[PDB]
């Protein structure tokens, strides 16, 4: 539902992969952890795992 600027971090919680996201046009204070199923950013995810 919102445009993602970049993935900052990744973690596993409750057996779910989650990404810490910086939302485009929003302050860092709005960064939130979102389960991977919530994302439609294959490019960013792909790039994150790559440079990881």
């Amino acid at each position: 539902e919102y445009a993602v600027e970049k993935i900052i971090d990744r973690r596993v919680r409750k057996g779910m992969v989650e990404y810490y996201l910086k939302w485009k046009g929003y302050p860092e204070t709005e960064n939130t952890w979102e389960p991977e199923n919530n994302l439609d950013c294959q490019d960013l995810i792909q790039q994150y795992e790559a440079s990881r």
Partner: peptide, 6 residues
């Protein structure tokens, strides 16, 4: 691209 905000 985009993402759902839980």
């Amino acid at each position: 691209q985009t993402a759902r905000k839980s």
